[PDB]
Design a protein around this ligand. Structure first.
Ligand SMILES: *[C@H]1O[C@H](CO)[C@H](O)[C@H](O)[C@H]1NC(C)=O
Ligand SMILES: *[C@H]1O[C@H](CO)[C@H](O)[C@H](O)[C@H]1NC(C)=O
Ligand SMILES: *[C@H]1O[C@H](CO)[C@H](O)[C@H](O)[C@H]1NC(C)=O
Ligand SMILES: *[C@H]1O[C@H](CO)[C@H](O)[C@H](O)[C@H]1NC(C)=O
Ligand SMILES: *[C@H]1O[C@H](CO)[C@H](O)[C@H](O)[C@H]1NC(C)=O
Lengths: 100, 10
């Protein structure tokens, strides 16, 4: 609902519109909170921020995709990951926000 | 090497 501030990155549940946000410089717990984990999301990253997602817990095994701006889940299904594969980040389980 | 990992279910 509320747009990400400049130094924040958010994912937003497609089902509920509830937002999960982190300031630049922070990461999630081992898993995202129970109220969002593994739900389908869109990305809403603030103007100075980049959202890093994993389809696994704990930002693990280089299973990490990069997202800037506003990204819809349909565009998150075959994304080049740090591990060299094209992964589906539309239902992420962990997250980090950095400066773009 | 210095990648994060997960635990199998416990
Ligand atoms: C982190 O992930 C990479 C993925 O290529 C490797 O599996 C690496 O062995 C992992 N790190 C540790 C500490 O096991
Ligand atoms: C992990 O740390 C080592 C320390 O020698 C290197 O910086 C390596 O490139 C790092 N790997 C990742 C995936 O961050
Ligand atoms: C992976 O998780 C470890 C903790 O187990 C560290 O927080 C590490 O920084 C994480 N990797 C990334 C890329 O955030
Ligand atoms: C993941 O496994 C590696 C071994 O490859 C390390 O034990 C690391 O501490 C583990 N991370 C977590 C969060 O369990
Ligand atoms: C840790 O959990 C991830 C999913 O979040 C993967 O299933 C990974 O294979 C697990 N690691 C171990 C050692 O079982």
């Amino acid at each position: 609902a509320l747009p990400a501030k400049e130094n924040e990155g958010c994912i937003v549940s497609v089902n509920s519109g509830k937002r999960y946000c982190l300031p630049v410089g922070q990461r999630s717990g081992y898993s995202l909170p129970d109220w969002i984990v593994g739900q389908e999301v869109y990305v809403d990253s603030g103007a100075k921020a980049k959202v890093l997602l994993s389809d696994w817990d704990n930002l693990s095994y280089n299973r990490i995709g990069e997202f800037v701006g506003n990204v819809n889940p349909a565009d998150m299904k075959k994304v080049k990951a740090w591990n060299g594969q094209y992964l589906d980040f539309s239902k992420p389980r962990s997250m980090r926000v950095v400066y773009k | 090497p210095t990648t994060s990992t997960t635990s199998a279910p416990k």
